[PDB]
Design a protein around this ligand. Structure first.
Ligand SMILES: Nc1ncnc2c1ncn2[C@@H]1O[C@H](COP(=O)(O)OP(=O)(O)O)[C@@H](O)[C@H]1O
Ligand SMILES: Nc1ncnc2c1ncn2[C@@H]1O[C@H](COP(=O)(O)OP(=O)(O)O)[C@@H](O)[C@H]1O
Ligand SMILES: [Mg+2]
Ligand SMILES: [Mg+2]
Lengths: 419, 419, 206
């Protein structure tokens, strides 16, 4: 009866539900087709069908209501919306539309929206008066996000080190510089666990580009939030389509005084798809990357803002270096000074089986006074003074043992005061 | 009714004004489109509409009246001027044009200027007899600008150190050598506060290139003047367009016996956009920078002159070094001997949590006799004699404590006379 | 209705043949105009003829002339186009006195082949030319005249020494520009100038 709950059901249960209804031969077909078939048969009974999803607008003028469960993949079960409804209710790409859907008549292959009663988890009339994201005035980050977890007390010190190396706030536009095989994937997973635990109210969204199918499944099971990803076998145009879907959805949520945190992986992979999709302008720069090709990633990355009126958009991205590819090096260079927080990883530290492989000297943040307190800020400065003479590798094992025998960061801070 | 006052109004109030007028669906759209819509509806009433802005001329021959509020960004609300009006009133890029604007007829998407009654804050007939900036004879700086603030008495000694290290006058062409993470941003902000306080009559203009959106907003709130900036996500051509807009506007104001102070950030960033925009000449020099590519920044930087007839143009720029980019090192080398004042910052001093991180020995100025007085000049020479044997790092903490316990620089000067 | 508008607008002698009239009627009126003009030229008078159109005129001439047993490309006989050549070539400047000026229109890209075969033989038979472009008209810019393609022969005799040099300077600037960008560039310059002399002295500034 309800579209959102039907997709969340297991595929094995989905076949059983359709068999007793009256349908046949639903076992050996894609799950998306099964949902369309079940809704089609259930529509004959005359009962109302509820549907919801993320709305996008095509270039022709009509739009479809994509579902975040299938990573915004086009399917027969997508809800079609006429352009006339767009005039009645001001809608743009990214917003969530929920309402009743009518059975598709002959000649059309998609369900049509009948009546909308919920826009962006709010009344449709109220959503019409929302201010657009681009008119909002950005500000520096001021809401400290405690990345350290005390109740878990796990053997991993990544959360404790991350706060000391570079505090993360709401609306940050930081990036992660991670060489290959340096624990980049687990670094994002640990951050996601703390966000889902310390700040359950904040909306957490994870976007992955050119990731293996088994890596996507593990991310969904581990991260307690909305995870959308595109596999490598999918075309480069699919990567562009999903990338714009995530940011547009986040912007609409920010307009409703909500905080959205986006874990991006990766800018280099994202810029790879953007360069291929954009047509050639007749001029090729160094590395085969056009000037206008990297304009799109700049728009996506720069959207991380702290709204003065209310809410914030936090974007955390990963940058790949020393991958053996020049094109990728050029992408990193243009994305150096664009970030508020920086987090540089070192392959050599990972070669010593010491984790997390974080370069404390290279890592840093801007305007850390607003995030931390007066007492906390001074303690961090004292720690950096001791670390700076030490090398990038010797600093980690020095910090790891100190944090290993201390319960919280406060206990570590008062220990350094003794010396 | 008036274009300039309508843009300064908050976006929230802008929607409310258009709702009672008769317009609808103004909430979910860009602020620039709202202004055009409100003016379009108000034009139907027949009331006259006043508009103003900075005039620029395109290559075709027609021009548009850009607004400094939107950082001279192209928009539907820009005022269009026919080439015929250019012959009637000699206008070039940079000048300010104010007058009535007629409603746009069918077939055109921009407002047209009806009658101009104010050119460069002066009668249009008088502006026609102004002499061009290039015909003016430059001279050395002779008007001392007191950068020290006494009433504030803040804990920051940057203003006091700046006067002692290198006095700044009207028409100076100095540059700032600032390594990354050396307090470069706050250095310009402190200078802007003193200029807006000690010399309210002088026009202060701040130009920022490739800066984060949150950094631009903070600069506008802190600096009491005209601030225009271009974000990193904008194309390199946008950076060139705004850079020429600021200097052309300054030159027109100088011709009217006015003093203009420009805070440039940064020459390396500005040269980065200029190199990309200019087409390749078939020859590539070291670092991928063409000889003609850096010609444009030289014209922009060299325009800082002290007019004998009246007025002056002061340009203060920042140079980035040790950013690990040969592209940026080559740019710095050609811009070494092109400054009347130099100010070199040291990263090592900033690592000691001592501010401002200014290399007193490296910093200096030319023709300081004209700026300072006979008595003041001798005191500075005595101080430099003591500082020179000391290192670049030990000199700061030696100077900081002396200035900390003294009220003004005069009290510090008489204290050194004791020894 | 087009003939009636022409008579009201043109202050002179206007004669035309409608489409419903037979092709022989078109031939009869065409010879009437040129023969009348020739007699007036003999009396030391100047006659200017606006022809529209050579392709339409050649269409009637081809049908009227009997077939010679040989058909060329496009169904147009060699002798069929002999008559339009006589009509068009009569434009002469008499040394003794008077002149005959003939201005004609040629139709191209009409989807026919006759209208091309006809245009090709009438290419190099003109003292002056004037090529219009459909693409320029699609931009709502008038007149849709291809400045680069248009030209004239022996323009030294018509214009003066000073005027001729100014035209050469203008053509030098226009030539690098495209056939479409040249018009709007020229239109705005002429729009803000009173006469062509004012436009000419403006280009001298650059
Ligand atoms: N916080 C951590 N603690 C212990 N081991 C880690 C940690 N993070 C990563 N690793 C090690 O890194 C390996 C996986 O690295 P991977 O995520 O593939 O690096 P990358 O993402 O750079 O390719 C695992 O075998 C794991 O043992
Ligand atoms: N005059 C000053 N007094 C105290 N601290 C300063 C001063 N100037 C800069 N800082 C410190 O520098 C940091 C910001 O540096 P930043 O402006 O990012 O350097 P850069 O502009 O070279 O990147 C702040 O955390 C601030 O504490
Ligand atoms: Mg990985
Ligand atoms: Mg800076």
């Amino acid at each position: 009866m309800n579209l959102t709950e039907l997709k969340n059901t297991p595929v094995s249960e989905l076949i059983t539900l359709g068999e007793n209804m009256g349908l046949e031969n639903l076992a050996r077909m894609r799950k998306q087709d099964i949902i369309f078939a079940i809704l089609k048969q259930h529509a004959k009974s005359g009962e109302d069908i509820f549907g919801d999803g993320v709305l996008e607008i095509l270039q022709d003028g009509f739009g479809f209501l994509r579902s975040a469960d299938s990573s915004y993949l086009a399917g027969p079960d997508d809800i079609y919306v006429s352009p006339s409804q767009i005039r009645r209710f001001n809608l743009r790409t990214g917003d969530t539309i929920s309402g009743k859907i009518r059975p598709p008549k002959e000649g059309e292959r998609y369900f049509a929206l009948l009546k909308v009663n919920e826009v962006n988890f709010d009344k449709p009339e109220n959503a019409r008066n929302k201010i657009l994201f681009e008119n909002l005035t950005p500000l520096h980050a001021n809401s400290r996000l405690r990345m350290e977890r005390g109740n878990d007390s796990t053997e991993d010190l990544t959360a404790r080190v991350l706060d000391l190396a570079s505090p993360i706030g709401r609306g940050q536009r930081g990036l992660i510089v991670a060489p290959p095989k340096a624990g980049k994937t687990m670094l994002l997973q640990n951050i996601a666990q703390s966000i889902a635990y310390n700040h359950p109210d904040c909306v957490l969204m994870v976007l992955l580009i050119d990731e293996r199918p088994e890596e996507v499944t593990e991310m969904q099971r581990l991260v307690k939030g909305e995870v959308v990803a595109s596999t490598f076998d999918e075309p480069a145009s699919r990567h562009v389509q999903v990338a714009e879907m995530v940011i547009e959805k986040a912007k609409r949520l920010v307009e409703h005084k909500k905080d959205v945190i986006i874990l991006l992986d990766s800018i280099t992979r994202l810029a790879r798809a953007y360069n291929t999709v954009v047509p050639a302008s007749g001029k090729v720069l160094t590395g085969g990357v056009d000037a206008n090709a990297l304009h799109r990633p700049k728009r996506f990355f720069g959207a991380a803002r702290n709204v003065e009126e209310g809410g914030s958009l936090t974007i955390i991205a990963t940058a790949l270096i020393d991958t053996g590819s020049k094109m990728d090096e050029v992408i990193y260079e243009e994305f150096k000074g664009t970030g508020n927080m920086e987090l540089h990883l070192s392959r050599k530290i990972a070669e010593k089986r010491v984790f997390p492989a974080i370069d404390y000297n290279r890592s840093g943040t801007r305007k850390e006074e607003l995030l931390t307190t007066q007492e906390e800020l001074q303690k961090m400065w004292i720690l950096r003074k001791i670390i700076h003479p030490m090398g990038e590798i010797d600093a980690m094992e020095f910090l790891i043992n100190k944090l290993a025998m201390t319960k919280t960061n406060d206990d570590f801070f008062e220990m350094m005061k003794r010396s």
